[PDB]
Amino acid sequence: DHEAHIKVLRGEPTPEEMAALMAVLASAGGGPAEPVKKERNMWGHPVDKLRYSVFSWQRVTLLERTHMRR
Amino acid sequence: DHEAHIKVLRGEPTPEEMAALMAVLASAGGGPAEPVKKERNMWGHPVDKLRYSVFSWQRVTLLERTHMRR
Numbered sequence: 001d002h003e004a005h006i007k008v009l010r011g012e013p014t015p016e017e018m019a020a021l022m023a024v025l026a027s028a029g030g031g032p033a034e035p036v037k038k039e040r041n042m043w044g045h046p047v048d049k050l051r052y053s054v055f056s057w058q059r060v061t062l063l064e065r066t067h068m069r070r
Numbered sequence: 071d072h073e074a075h076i077k078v079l080r081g082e083p084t085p086e087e088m089a090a091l092m093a094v095l096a097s098a099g100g101g102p103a104e105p106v107k108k109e110r111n112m113w114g115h116p117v118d119k120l121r122y123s124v125f126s127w128q129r130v131t132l133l134e135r136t137h138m139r140r
Contacts, residue, residue: 054137059129067124 042067112137 013021047066052059083091117136122129
């Protein structure tokens with residue numbers, strides 16, 4: 001067991017106060033956890049709009065890396 | 071003197087015949103004239119029309135070198 005739990009550091013609520021608290025906190029939860037449906041779409045990415053010198057090293061370290069990083 | 075000269079390897083022409091020979095050869099000699107320079111114009115060069123993978127090594131050894139070579 002290595003999840004970080006909610007801790008009541010001070011105070012001792014009754015079961016009904018604990019239930020009210022946890023229901024409120026869960027309603028205040030951040031919604032869906034993360035946007036797992038996010039999809040890669042590199043069309044018109046800003047790095048493709050830059051002018052690069054034909055001998056520019058940023059062709060390797062900026063342009064190519066941005067296209068290839070996954 | 072280290073020019074490569076015309077040599078008459080066989081025969082001994084009279085001066086009139088040497089003059090006829092040299093006049094005809096000098097009229098045949100033609101084309102380049104003075105060493106004019108073809109002006110560099112890279113617009114629409116074939117290497118720019120090729121598809122290169124983003125990680126293609128030919129971006130260095132073909133595309134860039136063709137643009138930079140002088």
